[PDB]
Design a protein around this nucleic acid. Structure first.
Lengths: 93, 1114, 77, 292, 48, 49, 49
RNA sequence: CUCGA
DNA sequence: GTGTCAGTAGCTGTCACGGATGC
DNA sequence: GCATCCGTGAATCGAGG
């Protein structure tokens, strides 16, 4: 139960507040390792981990690390569902 | 006698008119086209006898247009000639098996001419694997039989149009000069009485800009077009004047952003319309233009390009047409009428067949190679260059692959039954590249045109969204080398019909008057009646004196398609039901055993034979040894040829293609005779269905509006049983954690389900398999980090997961064949694949409740009840009927055919004997002597628009043979007395009883049933999948939602759009609550709406959900 | 090569959670047949919070899992 | 008309500066997914190509700004960035669309919402639903108006979880997990159990096109042999359904409220009259009127 | 008429017939010719 | 406009070659414009809804 | 604005909405159907709900 | 693409 | 690292209608 | 001030390749 649905113009500040990081590199993935390139359109630091509780560098692959920001790859450890709701952004020059 | 040419069964025809020409090869459309493409000896002989001078094969044409190839200086040259073919790489069936493409290597002869050294090196160059056409007119791409459909495209030439303004209500006129290739040019007269020209879609320039660019003085322009005020006003309202001014004005509108040089524009304005490089009217285009303007009418077709003379005469034509003129003579040309063109008329609507469609793709590939050659020439040294170093055949093979694999015209062959394939090969499509888009096809392109007579069929056309866009070629129609569809006509000299047959195009036909086929003719040739029906230019039908007829039709059935001509008493069916009948004949399912129809039309024989799914003897001889596997023929000269039968082969559409020998050991057989027929064939005639005993009466509502009631006899004796073969396929690839292995050892699977598997995990041949059973046991290794916490616990409290090939829901049959390809065993598989298994399952489908039957008159229905043989209303002698058709769905549809068909049907089953004593009765005076006596189960023909007249049928019903007991069961009205098998009492009134040909259409409940509790969900939208094959759910569309809202079923609507669809947590809790017996929980939010929100955000729209207090909630 | 929104590519399809859900529905039915301590231990090195030994962990885990296997196979798993 | 625009920005308190973007958002990856093909090659959403082209031009703008390129290049590059963001949001809106391979216009974000294939009409106003089936329809004269006959296999799949529940209850199966395997292997027990499950549980029949609300009606389901749906001859008129290959869809109301709505509001016996005119529909129509 | 007429009515378009109407009740002024048609009304009460 | 030449024959007598051909004009355009009519009708319907 | 965006001219409606900063009072059949709330009609109205 | 109501 | 000419395919064979866009 | 030209819209579900 929620009453109204509001819509309006998105301020640059709103766009940045949504994004979990900037998409600097234009790369997509690696065509051999199937891993998403860092700071690319699929960066796991930004949008999320490919698999559940699995970070990019492979240091944290277990469920025990719930909410740890890996220090060697910068990926958070939650369910891959977040790759369906985390926004990115490009900062325009 | 009917069809007395091959050695076929004597089917007797009610024909009153004689056939002066027998049907041509129904497959010539594809055959002649391809033979012209590759310049086979047969085609060159056909063109040599046709009077052609310097005929050119398609490949020869491409190589001559390309040759020679020079750089900008002209110091180097390369030329191609003489294309030839080595033997085919692999046989057809082997290609189908191994998923490769049927082709032959194409060799040419290329030579490099060096001008700075005066020496030439000429060698043979392999150009590529050239796809080859089967003998049945099909291609084979990656193991699938495809057909390349003939395309209806607008012919090249000059066309004039008279449009009507919406606002000023004045008549405007336009012109289009459409070339076979190059830039377009269209002139027009706007509503300000000024003439303009648009060059390659670009801005509308004044029509005098073009004349100024060409070096014509303004005074000479006023000299030519002075008789029109509109052209004077154009030259006055002109902006810039000067030969070098309008030239640059064109240059900066055609190629903007470039410095305008006088010569850089002088070069392209001559190249885009007068140099054969980037502009070319095919010989046909040049001829069409030469007629429309009336110039060069004597010159041989050698100029493949547009000329300034043409443009001047064209603008003259236009300007004269605008101001009401009706006649024009070009300076130095013949007089010509001034009119607009139809672009729907089959003299302006061209048909390009396989050959041409392929030549265009080859041309693209060749130009792409030509550019690479010109670059590679100025790179390598000028003494070690060979044709082998210059030629890069990559774009050519890529071009032919891109065509066959991806094209609206390369269509997956319709292979339900031989007639479907034949029609598919004789299709005329308007859609495709160069033609038009479906969104760009008005009610006018689709409706019948008076020029389709004898060329395209006005009946056979889909009734879906493609109606009118897809026709079938008329029976006697052929294609000329220019692309137009010619039809034959008999020349009438002096009111005398001649056996001289000449083929005419559309515009050629309009220049004469032709008589309808069924005109009364003298035994010498003179017309009986002075007035005769006649077709006249612009599709005008009227009577005309006998001394006016120039030609007449060849056969009555000249206008119809192959399928259409297979409808008995077609002349009594309405075009709608006739269309449905001709379209449903192509949906007939090949039955286990095939019976030819009692009532035919004559077309069945040649349809079957030309379809190519039968086996005809190439040369005469005797049968040395005949087996169910093969048939060997010992010719008279001494050679032997062995024809192998195709046994239980899977058609493209799961129907069973199975050929059986007809002849026996030591039988004399002539050349061209059918020695073995295939699906839907009987002694060489199309047997699309069965002859069923029909009673036309209502029966306890089980046949209520268009439903059908059948006798279980048809189940017991496999009368409507048909075979269907499904292909199942699985592979074993390399995975990230290892490699999938196909193994009988499957985790947590009993030895009882694995009982039917061999050591490999493959099912064994002959095993019956229900839906869900294992066919190929494949396990794939799953990683530990991919396990559910409950899954990991269940693993701890007790690494490969099951990926076996199971039988899909609704499938079941005997496993008849297996095919295994292993990368270990030489078998070339796609990279990353180690094994591949294909399992073939055959099901023997009896006729079921809900299966769809149909006749030849668009009379269709589904099986609503199959009664026991004793329940059926039975005839006087105890023989129960087979099928009960409701009466109410008969006189509404206007398909009187079946009625007639029914009556004659009975006549053919019992036979007849006309009273010969005291002379020939007055009704049968027109019948051939062969029809006055007939034995039971006799074969007959009702040729379309000829054949049995109602009077003769009445008589035949009067003289029907009695049964074995000496009793006549049907009355002269055609009705008989029936007994209710359920109560015994006879039915109060006489009922129409007869025999009708019914076909089993390919719409069976065994395929069309489906149901889903749960299953896959699309990842993005989280809504259930679609389609039975993906185990999907049905779509609750917008209209159905309106229905819900209408009823006010709020909770049902919510439940449909939430827990039953994309409520990620709600659907799970519903499943849990059902298995628990608890109540259904409260629906959550649809994930699809979350997706909507995220998308609206991706478009910089800040959408927020507010609570009743005003705080945004997440 | 291809594009997802190009008419000619499959759809990322996710399975129907039937099994996983039934499995967890059973696992939850053999949890009422436990003692609150075995429960609190299984629903989690844990020896640091619950304030017990690590041998007590190992054991409680051991016997608890065996009670679970007993219950399950009692149901016919 | 100008005031209609300006007063909006005036009152609502949002700045017109919003119409010019300094940063563009990137849609989550799962909504621009990248799938793998059975040949080892890859297929990707068009949004990825568009975002990628925009990123390329933006990084090139950064390079040009740092390298002090001539003003002409910097400006002619900014223009391309503008065109590329335009394409990302509504490709083809201005001028010629961005052609993909095959001269095919690429789908934009705003292309995800328009028309029949858009999110609104395709995935919101009408979804695809679990617990549903479809098959050919056949006339069943012996049926009562409130009855309809569905094939055994159809109902077994539709009521699958209900059948599993009852099977594990009557101890035909050890656990629910094994009841599922029983239903999937079609063991003969279910057919005697299924009758208990479908008892008086109404189902909804729909025939497209669903023109008016009587295009969907409720029925008591009757297990029939065969694989076709048996429909009552009087409701044909409502569904405008002949029997020459017509197919109908079946939906299973789940919640108690859904069952009540179907039983009361949508039952065929409670909908004899035409809501448009008030004249009856489920009346003798063809053969029936002839016999009478 | 026809279905396009239903659309004309439901979309409140300026119809094809574009028939005029009496803006004020009064006496008709048939002034028919052949070049054109002009009709006036004299208001039954006051008016112009 | 109606053709100045009728279809004299009935379906019980048997249409001539040209009679069937001239019937197909109308039959085919009937099917075509019926498709178009259904389209426009459905669109008007959703508007009214 | 949700009921209008789902009808016609989706882009032309959403632009106007974002400009006017419109709020949708989720109280309409089309809208509740979109978001999955009970429709305020038939069995969904407050009297019977 | 082809097809069914 | 790059250096003599070195230059789309395709296409118009939809239409009614309203209103901002533009001369 | 008005004609041009831009953008909007154009039935529902279903099968197989």
């Amino acid at each position: 139960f929620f009453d109204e649905l509001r819509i309006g113009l998105a301020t640059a500040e709103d766009i940045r507040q949504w994004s979990y990081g900037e998409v600097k590199k234009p790369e997509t993935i690696n065509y051999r390792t199937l891993k998403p390139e860092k700071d690319g359109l699929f960066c796991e630091k930004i949008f999320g981990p490919t698999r559940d509780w699995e970070c990019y560098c492979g240091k944290y692959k277990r469920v025990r690390f719930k909410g740890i920001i890996c220090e060697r790859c910068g990926v958070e450890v939650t369910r891959a569902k977040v790759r369906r709701e985390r926004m990115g952004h490009i900062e325009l020059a | 006698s009917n069809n007395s040419v091959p050695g076929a069964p004597n089917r007797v025809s009610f024909a009153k008119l004689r056939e002066p020409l027998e049907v041509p090869g129904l497959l010539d459309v594809q055959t002649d086209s391809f033979e012209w493409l590759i310049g086979s000896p047969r085609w060159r002989e056909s063109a040599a006898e046709r009077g052609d001078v310097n005929p050119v094969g398609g490949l020869e044409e491409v190589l001559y247009e390309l040759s020679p190839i020079e750089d900008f200086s002209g110091s180097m040259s390369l030329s191609f000639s003489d294309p030839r073919f080595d033997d085919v790489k692999a046989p057809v069936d082997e290609c189908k098996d191994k998923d490769m493409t049927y082709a032959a290597p194409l060799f040419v002869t290329a030579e490099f001419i060096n001008n700075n050294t005066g020496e030439i090196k000429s060698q043979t160059v392999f150009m590529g694997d050239f796809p080859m056409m089967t003998e049945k007119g099909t291609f084979i791409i990656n193991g699938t039989e495809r057909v390349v459909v003939s395309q209806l495209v607008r012919s090249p030439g000059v066309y004039f149009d008279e449009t009507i303004d919406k606002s000023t209500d004045k008549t405007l006129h336009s012109v289009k000069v459409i070339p076979s290739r190059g830039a377009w040019l269209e002139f027009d007269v706007d509503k300000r009485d000024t003439v303009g020209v648009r060059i390659d879609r670009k801005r509308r320039q004044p029509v005098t800009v073009l004349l100024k660019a060409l070096g014509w003085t303004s005074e000479q322009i006023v000299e030519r077009f002075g008789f029109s005020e509109i052209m004077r006003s154009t030259l006055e309202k002109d902006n810039t004047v000067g030969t070098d001014e309008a030239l640059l004005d064109i240059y900066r509108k055609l190629r903007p952003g470039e410095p305008p040089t006088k010569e850089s524009a002088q070069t392209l304005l001559e190249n885009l319309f007068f140099k054969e490089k980037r502009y070319d009217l095919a010989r046909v285009g040049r001829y069409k233009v030469n007629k429309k303007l009336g110039l060069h009418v004597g010159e041989p077709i050698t100029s493949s390009t547009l000329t300034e003379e043409d443009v001047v005469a064209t603008i003259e034509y236009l300007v004269r047409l605008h101001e009401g003129q009706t006649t024009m003579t070009v300076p130095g040309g013949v007089e010509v009428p001034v009119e607009t063109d139809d672009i729907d008329h089959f003299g302006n609507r061209r048909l390009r067949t396989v050959g041409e469609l392929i030549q265009n793709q080859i041309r693209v590939g060749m130009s792409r190679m030509e550019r690479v050659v010109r670059e590679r020439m100025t790179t390598q040294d000028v003494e070690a260059i060979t044709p082998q170093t210059l030629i890069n055949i990559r774009p050519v093979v890529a071009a032919i692959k891109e065509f066959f694999g991806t094209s609206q015209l390369s269509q997956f062959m319709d292979q339900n039954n031989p007639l479907s394939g034949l029609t598919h090969k004789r299709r005329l499509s308007a859609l495709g590249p160069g033609g038009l888009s479906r969104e760009r096809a008005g009610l006018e392109v689709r409706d019948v045109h008076p020029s389709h007579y004898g060329r395209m069929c006005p009946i056979e056309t889909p009734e879906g969204p493609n109606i009118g866009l897809i026709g079938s070629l008329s029976v006697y129609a052929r294609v000329n080398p220019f692309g137009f569809i010619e039809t034959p006509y008999r020349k009438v000299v002096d009111g005398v019909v001649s056996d001289e047959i000449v083929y005419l195009t559309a515009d050629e036909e309009d220049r004469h008057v032709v008589a309808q086929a069924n005109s009364p003719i003298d035994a010498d040739g003179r017309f009986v009646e002075p007035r005769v029906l006649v077709r006249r230019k612009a599709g005008e039908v009227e009577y005309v004196p006998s001394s006016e007829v120039d030609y007449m039709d060849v056969s009555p059935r000249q206008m119809v398609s192959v399928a259409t001509a297979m409808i008995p008493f077609l002349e009594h069916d309405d075009a709608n039901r006739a269309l449905m009948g001709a379209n449903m004949q192509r949906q007939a399912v090949p039955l286990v055993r095939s019976e030819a129809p009692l009532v035919g039309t004559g077309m069945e024989l040649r349809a079957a034979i030309d379809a190519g799914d039968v086996v005809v003897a190439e040369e005469s001889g005797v049968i040395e040894e005949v087996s169910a596997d093969y048939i060997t023929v010992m010719h008279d000269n001494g050679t032997r040829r062995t024809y192998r039968m195709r046994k239980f082969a899977r058609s493209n559409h799961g129907t069973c293609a199975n050929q059986c020998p007809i002849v026996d050991a030591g039988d004399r057989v002539e050349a061209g005779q059918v020695i073995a027929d295939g699906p839907c064939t009987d002694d060489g005639e199309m047997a699309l269905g069965k002859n069923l005993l029909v009673a036309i009466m209502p029966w306890e509502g089980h046949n209520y509006e268009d439903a059908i009631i059948l006798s279980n006899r048809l189940v017991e004796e496999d009368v409507l049983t048909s075979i269907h073969i499904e292909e199942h396929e699985i592979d074993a690839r390399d995975t990230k954690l290892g490699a999938e292995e196909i193994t009988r050892d499957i985790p947590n699977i009993s030895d009882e389900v694995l009982a039917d598997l061999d050591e490999r995990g493959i099912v064994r041949i002959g095993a019956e398999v229900r839906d869900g059973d294992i066919l190929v046991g494949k396990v794939t290794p799953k990683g530990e980090t991919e396990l559910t916490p409950e899954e990991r616990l269940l693993r701890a409290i007790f690494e490969v997961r099951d990926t076996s090939l199971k039988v899909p829901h609704g499938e079941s049959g005997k496993v008849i064949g297996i095919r295994v390809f292993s990368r270990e065993d030489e078998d070339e598989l796609p990279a990353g694949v180690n094994e591949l298994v294909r399992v073939y399952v055959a099901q023997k489908r009896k006729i079921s409740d809900g299966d769809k039957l149909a006749g030849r008159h668009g009379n269709k229905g589904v099986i609503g009840k199959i009664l026991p043989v004793e329940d059926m209303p039975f005839l006087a002698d105890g023989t129960p009927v087979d099928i009960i058709l409701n009466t109410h769905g008969v006189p509404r549809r206007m398909n009187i055919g079946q009625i007639l068909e029914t009556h004659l049907g009975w006549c053919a089953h019992s036979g007849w004997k006309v009273d010969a004593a005291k002379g020939v009765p007055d009704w049968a005076a027109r019948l051939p002597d062969e029809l006055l006596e007939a034995q039971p189960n006799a074969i007959v023909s009702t040729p379309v628009f000829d054949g049995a007249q109602e009077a003769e049928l009445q008589g035949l019903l009067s003289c029907t043979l009695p049964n074995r007991d000496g009793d006549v069961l049907v009355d002269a009205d055609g009705k008989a007395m029936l007994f209710d098998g359920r109560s015994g009492e006879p039915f109060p009134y006489p009922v129409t009883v007869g025999y009708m040909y019914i076909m089993k259409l390919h719409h069976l409940v065994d395929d069309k049933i489906h149901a889903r509790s749960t299953g896959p969900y699309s990842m993005i939208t989280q809504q259930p999948l679609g389609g039975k094959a993906q185990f999907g759910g049905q779509r609750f569309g917008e209209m159905e939602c309106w229905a819900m809202q209408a009823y006010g079923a709020a909770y049902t609507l919510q439940e449909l759009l939430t827990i039953k669809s994309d409520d990620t947590v709600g659907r799970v809790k519903v499943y849990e609550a059902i298995v628990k017996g608890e109540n259904i929980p409260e629906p959550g939010i649809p994930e699809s709406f979350k997706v909507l929100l995220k998308e609206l955000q991706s478009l910089c729209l800040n959408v927020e959900v507010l609570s009743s207090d005003g705080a945004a909630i997440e | 090569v291809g594009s997802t929104d190009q008419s000619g590519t499959p759809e990322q399809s996710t399975p129907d959670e039937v099994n996983a859900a039934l499995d967890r529905l059973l696992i939850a039915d053999a949890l009422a047949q436990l003692s609150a301590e075995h429960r609190a231990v299984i629903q989690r090195q844990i020896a640091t919070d619950l304030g017990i030994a690590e041998g007590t962990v190992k054991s409680r885990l051991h016997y608890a899992v065996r009670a679970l296997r007993l219950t399950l196979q009692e149901l016919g798993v | 008309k100008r005031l209609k625009v300006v007063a909006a920005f005036q009152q609502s308190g949002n700045s017109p500066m919003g119409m010019v973007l300094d940063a563009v958002p990137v849609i989550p990856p799962e909504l621009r997914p990248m799938v793998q093909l059975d040949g080892g090659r890859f297929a990707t959403s068009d949004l990825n190509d568009l975002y990628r082209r925009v990123i390329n031009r933006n990084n090139r703008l950064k390079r040009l700004i740092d390298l002090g390129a001539p003003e002409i290049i910097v400006n002619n590059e900014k223009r391309m960035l503008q065109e590329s963001v335009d394409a990302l949001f509504d490709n083809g809106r201005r001028g010629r669309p961005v052609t993909g391979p095959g001269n095919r216009p690429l789908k934009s974000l705003s292309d995800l919402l328009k028309g029949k294939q858009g999110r609104f009409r395709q995935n919101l106003l009408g979804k695809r639903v679990d617990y549903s089936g479809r098959s050919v329809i056949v006339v069943g004269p012996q049926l009562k108006l409130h009855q309809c006959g569905l094939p055994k296999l159809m109902a077994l799949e539709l009521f699958k979880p209900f059948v599993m529940k009852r099977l594990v209850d009557l101890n035909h199966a050890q656990n629910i997990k094994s009841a599922k395997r029983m239903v999937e292997r079609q063991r003969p027990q279910v057919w005697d159990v299924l009758e208990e499950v479908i008892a008086e549980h109404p189902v909804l029949l729909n025939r497209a096109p669903t023109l008016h609300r009587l295009g969907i009606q409720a029925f008591e389901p009757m297990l029939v042999e065969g694989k076709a749906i048996q429909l009552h001859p009087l409701v044909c008129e409502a569904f405008n359904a002949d029997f020459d290959g017509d197919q109908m869809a079946v939906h299973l109301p789940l919640s108690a409220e859904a069952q009540a709505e179907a039983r009361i509001l949508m039952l065929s016996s409670n909908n004899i009259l035409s809501p448009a005119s008030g004249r009856p529909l489920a009346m003798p129509r063809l053969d029936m009127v002839t016999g009478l | 008429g026809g279905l396009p007429r239903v659309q004309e009515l439901f979309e409140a378009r300026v119809p094809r017939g574009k028939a005029p109407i009496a803006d004020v009740t009064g006496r008709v002024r048939l002034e028919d010719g052949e070049r054109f048609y002009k009709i006036t009304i004299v208001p039954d009460d006051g008016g112009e | 406009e109606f053709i100045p030449r009728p279809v004299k024959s009935s379906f019980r007598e048997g249409l001539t070659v040209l009679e069937y051909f001239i019937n197909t004009h109308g039959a085919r355009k009937g099917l075509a414009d019926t498709a178009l009519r259904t389209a426009d009708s459905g669109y008007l319907t959703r508007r009214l809804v | 604005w949700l009921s209008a965006a789902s009808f016609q001219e989706t882009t032309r409606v959403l632009t106007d909405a974002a400009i006017n900063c419109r709020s949708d009072k989720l109280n309409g059949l089309k809208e509740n159907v979109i978001i999955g709330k009970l429709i305020p009609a038939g069995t969904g109205i407050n009297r019977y709900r």
